[PDB]
Amino acid sequence: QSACTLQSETHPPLTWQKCSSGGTCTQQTGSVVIDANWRWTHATNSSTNCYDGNTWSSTLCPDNETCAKNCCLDGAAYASTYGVTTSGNSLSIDFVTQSAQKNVGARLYLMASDTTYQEFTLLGNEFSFDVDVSQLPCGLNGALYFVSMDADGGVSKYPTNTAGAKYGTGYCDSQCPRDLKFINGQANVEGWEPSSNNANTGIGGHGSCCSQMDIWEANSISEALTPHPCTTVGQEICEGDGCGGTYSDNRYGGTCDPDGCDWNPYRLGNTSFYGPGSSFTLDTTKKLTVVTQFETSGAINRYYVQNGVTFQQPNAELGSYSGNELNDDYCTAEEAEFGGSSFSDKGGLTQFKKATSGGMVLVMSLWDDYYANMLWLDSTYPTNETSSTPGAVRGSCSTSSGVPAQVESQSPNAKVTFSNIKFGPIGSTGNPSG
Amino acid sequence: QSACTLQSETHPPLTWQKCSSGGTCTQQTGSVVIDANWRWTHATNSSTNCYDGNTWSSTLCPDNETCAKNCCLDGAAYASTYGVTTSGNSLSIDFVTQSAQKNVGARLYLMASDTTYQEFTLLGNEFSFDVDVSQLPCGLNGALYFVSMDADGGVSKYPTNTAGAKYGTGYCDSQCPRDLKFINGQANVEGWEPSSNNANTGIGGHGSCCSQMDIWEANSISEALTPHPCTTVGQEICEGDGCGGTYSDNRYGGTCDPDGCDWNPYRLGNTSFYGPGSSFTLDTTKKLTVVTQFETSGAINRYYVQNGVTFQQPNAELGSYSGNELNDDYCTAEEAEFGGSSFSDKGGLTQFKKATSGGMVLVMSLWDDYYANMLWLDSTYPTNETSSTPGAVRGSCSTSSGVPAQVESQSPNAKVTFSNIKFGPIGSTGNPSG
Ligand SMILES: O[C@@H]1[C@@H](O)[C@H](O[C@@H]2CO[C@@H](O[C@@H]3CO[C@@H](O[C@@H]4CO[C@@H](O)[C@H](O)[C@H]4O)[C@H](O)[C@H]3O)[C@H](O)[C@H]2O)OC[C@H]1O
Ligand SMILES: O[C@@H]1[C@@H](O)[C@H](O[C@@H]2CO[C@@H](O[C@@H]3CO[C@@H](O[C@@H]4CO[C@@H](O)[C@H](O)[C@H]4O)[C@H](O)[C@H]3O)[C@H](O)[C@H]2O)OC[C@H]1O
Ligand SMILES: OC[C@H]1O[C@@H](O[C@H]2[C@H](O)[C@@H](O)[C@H](O)O[C@@H]2CO)[C@H](O)[C@@H](O)[C@H]1O
Ligand SMILES: OC[C@H]1O[C@@H](O[C@H]2[C@H](O)[C@@H](O)[C@H](O)O[C@@H]2CO)[C@H](O)[C@@H](O)[C@H]1O
Ligand SMILES: *[C@@H]1O[C@H](CO)[C@@H](O)[C@H](O)[C@H]1NC(C)=O
Ligand SMILES: *[C@@H]1O[C@H](CO)[C@@H](O)[C@H](O)[C@H]1NC(C)=O
Ligand SMILES: [Co+2]
Ligand SMILES: [Co+2]
Ligand SMILES: [Co+2]
């Protein structure tokens, strides 16, 4: 796609700290951009929609190539249309925003410049952020994570994409998502099937795959930390059901691991660690600090700080595994005890280390779940299982929770606030911000 | 040996913090006891010495059994004879103390009660302490470490030892030391050879072996962190040169690893990390906090705090190893690049995990080195090597430094102060002390 300018594109600014081993941190100035899927897609030479509701213009978009030539992405009114605001080092995303039309949530990338994404090499480093999840009920997910996207959003590889990172192109993740309207500088109109339950979305014949570090998927009830390896580390197109992922019939018939080696303290048996109010170790009615460390072995360590008190990731015992570090032994034990082979089939932490050794883009988002109502995060899943199934219970939410239309109607003012991002060598981010 | 009471035994008290995962710490009250080797050893029924200078009484001690029956250990005047004092959570050890006779240094164990050692299970936990090494020049070693000693100092196994932990019996370490005057409830007079350079010591026909976690061996110039595995985890007698260790002809012909997998930041190439004055990352003229974490994988992590600034163990690159965690890959790479096979021959971190999974006793000591002048810690070693030999340079001290008689004459008022010991689950010790 190209870019159009009927609405100007001004990325909300966002600062963050880069810390060094010598013990100081210095402020960096970036900004955030909204993913292309949220944008208005229209004819280059008029305001005629190329995509409307959940269907494509059959005339402007008779095939993927013609569609990309005919169509452009336009700018975003971040606050009024999308409910996205920033203030210094803080970013807030509102759940449902009513303007001329209703918008649901947002997916945002941190930029290095107006036209390029910020890339982070996670390996040997740590990433710290503060979050307020108090306004996230059952069925919502305020997510902070990393994906192996190109810094230009795909322009160098696919010159029919001239919109680039400035317009949030180039997304990929470990679900090999097929709901993207543009992949590899072409539309995804070929094979398009509108969602049966979502007025704004569909599934196309192509998907976009890459490695994913799910640092934080969470609401006020549950939180999970999950690496997802792929056999191709970086962004790669996939064809139809060969994609695997949430958007395909065959979840496991692709190049990525859509399940991941997840660590959810509630799932692992500590139901007292994280939740709303003073009966939990971390009180989710209040802001908390989350720190994630990527040691060179490829294991992941985690601690939290709230009101000046530090807590490592709680210990878990699973099969022969015991401890609080997300390592090979944990992931192998998880598969043994909870089931599945996707994470190991895709090469486990060894393959995942190839992603964190390279550059990844930071994503912050707020979403509800049209496929599974977020039950995999905060409820019992599958819903016919009981607590006697190992790993079935992931949170306290009812198995009836998270129906998108219901949560959008009942909790439109839900929101997430991410703030005080700090990045540097392991051990460095607790030092004073510059 | 038995105990005698011509001098009363009052262990200097010492408090420390036990921290919990829930984020609080509570004060514990223990005390310190001096190792039996430092004590006066005399006939049970008089003040006649069983051991004097570096030789044994041939009449009281004609063999190991008769000697133990005839002889007792007596109490210690901690301050006036040994230069050992405590105040709340602080312990100080002076280098040379002149009373009726000259004493050099001390080795001390933390007690649970007047008659038992405190045991710590290191695995899954972390140990924090503060240290002032400002008064430790080249050739001195203020050491804090753990060994797999019996809590009773050997009494249950060896009933001819009735003195026990109260009198500091039962020592063992990864050098399988043969300088101990009592091992396994018998004397070590058989095979005794007085030291050629030490008026107060010798080497006997028996040694005492066990696993050793050298958390801290350091002076103002260099510091090292070193696990040492043994094929028998706990305390075990050894016979003569079959002992291996510093005190034998054949260093590597025993059940313990006397070299260990050592991590010395200077040795590994960061000569700027630790030293006297503001040109170093950690200024050794001032107190610093040292934290050591024993993750369940069996790897060891380390960070430091000084004036509120936190530093992870500095990154090192060695062969194919890169990072700051002391793990299998580090230790294997060290052997490959610096030489040796002792650590791996004795089972590496896997065998060492058997020690940290069990109970270990905390040892604090101050010593000079009659075998190697501490050059392995703070100088170039062996001394004929140059900087072009990988790992030869371990510190900035001259290869002429650390001659015991010289340092005892020039720096008698050298001292070490250990304080603010805190122990608990990984992530817990930075929380407020109770
Ligand atoms: O000036 C007018 C434009 O503002 C207007 O723009 C519309 C803006 O909203 C667009 O709809 C977006 C599409 O994305 C939705 O989010 C999905 C959430 O689930 C994800 O899996 C998926 O990938 C996302 O696509 C978002 O909720 C929704 O609001 C709409 O298509 C634009 O046309 O157009 C008309 C102009 O007059
Ligand atoms: O009342 C008098 C007693 O106080 C007196 O006791 C003497 C106290 O000092 C004893 O000598 C100790 C022996 O240990 C030395 O340390 C060695 C350091 O290197 C280590 O490897 C080794 O294992 C340690 O043994 C310490 O420096 C030295 O002072 C002496 O033997 C006692 O007899 O006895 C006479 C009473 O009248
Ligand atoms: O709704 C898709 C969701 O699945 C998670 O993986 C689940 C998996 O679907 C389920 O079969 C298993 O029992 O639990 C897994 C972990 O919660 C993914 O982690 C998530 O990214 C989504 O893809
Ligand atoms: O003086 C004995 C001392 O040796 C250390 O191990 C040395 C070893 O002696 C040397 O050959 C090698 O080059 O360096 C090693 C590490 O410094 C031990 O660590 C120490 O405990 C002592 O036993
Ligand atoms: C030494 O280590 C410190 C702490 O990690 C680091 O800040 C410094 O840059 C290192 N210097 C060198 C020269 O290796
Ligand atoms: C849950 O984790 C916290 C933090 O480690 C710990 O303090 C608490 O005891 C744990 N509780 C249970 C019931 O597992
Ligand atoms: Co195709
Ligand atoms: Co680790
Ligand atoms: Co014997």
Closest approach of A312 to chain B, Cα-based (Å): 5
Burial A378-402 (b: 16+ CB within 10 A, else e): bbbbeeeeeeeebbbbbbbbeeebb
- Closest-CA residue of A relative to B282 is A22
To one decimal, the resolution in angstroms is 1.5
DSSP state of A118: P
Rounded to whole angstroms, the Cα distance separating B131 from A341 reads: 48
Beta strand spans in A59-105 (E): 71-73, 84-87, 90-94, 96-98, 102-104
Q: Do A327 and B431 touch (CB under 8 A)?
A: no
Rounded to whole angstroms, the Cα distance separating B400 from A376 reads: 66
A361 forms beta bridges with A119, A147
Q: Quick one: which of B237, B226, B259, B256 has its CA closest to B346?
A: B256
Q: Which amino acid is at B99?
A: S
Q: Are B8 and B75 in contact (CB under 8 A)?
A: yes
Beta-carbon contacts of B38 under 8 Å, excluding residues fewer than 6 positions away, are B76, B82, B103, B106, B107, B168
Q: Quick one: which of B3, B358, B9, B424 has its CA closest to B150?
A: B358
- Kindly state the helix (H) or strand (E) to which residue B73 belongs, with its residue range: strand B71-73
**Coil vs helix vs strand at B169:** coil
Contacts of B430 in chain A (CB under 8 A): 310
Q: Do A324 and B299 touch (CB under 8 A)?
A: no
Count the domains in chain B: 1
The structure tokens listed for A274 are: 């994280």
Rounded to whole angstroms, the Cα distance separating A414 from A396 reads: 19
- Angle at which helix B328-338 crosses helix B348-356, to 10 degrees, equals 130
Closest approach of A311 to chain B, Cα-based (Å): 6
Find the CB nearest B325 among A297, A324, A428.
Answer: A297
Sign of the dihedral defined by the CA atoms of residues B80, B82, B86, B91, in that order = positive
DSSP 3-state helix, strand, coil percentages of chain B (rounded to 5)? 10, 35, 50
**Coil vs helix vs strand at A320:** coil
The structure tokens listed for A190 are: 């070929």
The structure tokens listed for B55 are: 């030789």
Q: Which amino acid is at A378?
A: D
- Closest-CA residue of B relative to A426 is B312
B360 forms beta bridges with B120
Burial class (CB in 10 A: 0-12, 13-18, 19+), A350: exposed
Beta strand spans in A285-385 (E): 288-294, 300-306, 309-312, 316-318, 321-323, 359-368
- Kindly state the helix (H) or strand (E) to which residue A405 belongs, with its residue range: helix A404-410
**Which of A103, A363, A366 for a ligand 1 pocket mutation test, highest count of atoms within 8 Å of Cβ?**
A103
Closest approach of B206 to chain A, Cα-based (Å): 39
C-beta of A365 in contact with ligand 3 (< 6 A) = no
The structure tokens listed for A297 are: 């072995």
Q: Do B311 and A426 touch (CB under 8 A)?
A: no
Rounded to whole angstroms, the Cα distance separating B434 from B432 reads: 6
Rounded to whole angstroms, the Cα distance separating A154 from B161 reads: 77
Q: Are A277 and A285 in contact (CB under 8 A)?
A: yes
**Coil vs helix vs strand at A349:** helix
What is the extent of the structural domain holding B114? 2-434
C-beta of B38 in contact with ligand 2 (< 6 A) = yes
C-beta of A314 in contact with ligand 6 (< 6 A) = yes
What residue owns the CA closest to ligand 5's atom 12? B270
Closest approach of A340 to chain B, Cα-based (Å): 23
C-beta of A272 in contact with ligand 6 (< 6 A) = yes
The structure tokens listed for A140 are: 């919502």
CATH code of the domain in which B174 resides: 2.70.100.10
Q: Are B251 and B241 in contact (CB under 8 A)?
A: no
Rounded to whole angstroms, the Cα distance separating B25 from A156 reads: 56
Rounded to whole angstroms, the Cα distance separating B229 from B147 reads: 11
Cis peptide before B382 (omega within 30 of 0): yes
Q: Do A311 and B427 touch (CB under 8 A)?
A: yes
Find the CB nearest A323 among B22, B23, B295.
Answer: B295
Q: Are A342 and A244 in contact (CB under 8 A)?
A: no
The structure tokens listed for A85 are: 């605001």
Contacts of A295 in chain B (CB under 8 A): 301, 323, 325
- In this structure, the number of other CB atoms found within 10 A of the CB of residue A206 comes to 23
- In this structure, the number of other CB atoms found within 10 A of the CB of residue B249 comes to 9
- Kindly state the helix (H) or strand (E) to which residue B55 belongs, with its residue range: strand B55-56
Q: Quick one: which of A348, A335, A349 has its CA closest to A391?
A: A335
Ligand 4 center to B365 CA (angstroms): 18
The structure tokens listed for A424 are: 């540097």
Sign of the dihedral defined by the CA atoms of residues A340, A342, A344, A345, in that order = positive
Find the CB nearest A311 among B21, B299, B327.
Answer: B21
C-beta of A306 in contact with ligand 6 (< 6 A) = no
Conformation bin of residue A164: beta by default, left when phi > 0, alpha when psi is -120 to 50: left
Rounded to whole angstroms, the Cα distance separating A178 from A37 reads: 11
Distances (CA, A) of A283 to A131, A132, A220, A305: 12, 10, 9, 11
Distances (CA, A) of B284 to A239, B135, B261: 61, 9, 24
Rounded to whole angstroms, the Cα distance separating A119 from A10 reads: 20
Ligand 5 pocket, Cβ-based, cut-off 6 angstroms: A 21-22; B 270, 272-273, 281, 311, 314
DSSP state of A408: H
**Coil vs helix vs strand at A166:** helix
Rounded to whole angstroms, the Cα distance separating B366 from B416 reads: 7
* 3-state SS, one letter per residue, for B179-202: CCCEECCEECCCCCEECCCCCCCE
Q: Which amino acid is at B240?
A: G
The structure tokens listed for B80 are: 């006036």
Rounded to whole angstroms, the Cα distance separating A415 from A134 reads: 8
Q: Which amino acid is at A82?
A: Y
Burial class (CB in 10 A: 0-12, 13-18, 19+), B90: middle
- Kindly state the helix (H) or strand (E) to which residue A129 belongs, with its residue range: strand A125-132
**Coil vs helix vs strand at B377:** helix
Kind of pairing, strands A415-425 and A90-94? antiparallel
C-beta of B322 in contact with ligand 4 (< 6 A) = no
Rounded to whole angstroms, the Cα distance separating B241 from B228 reads: 19
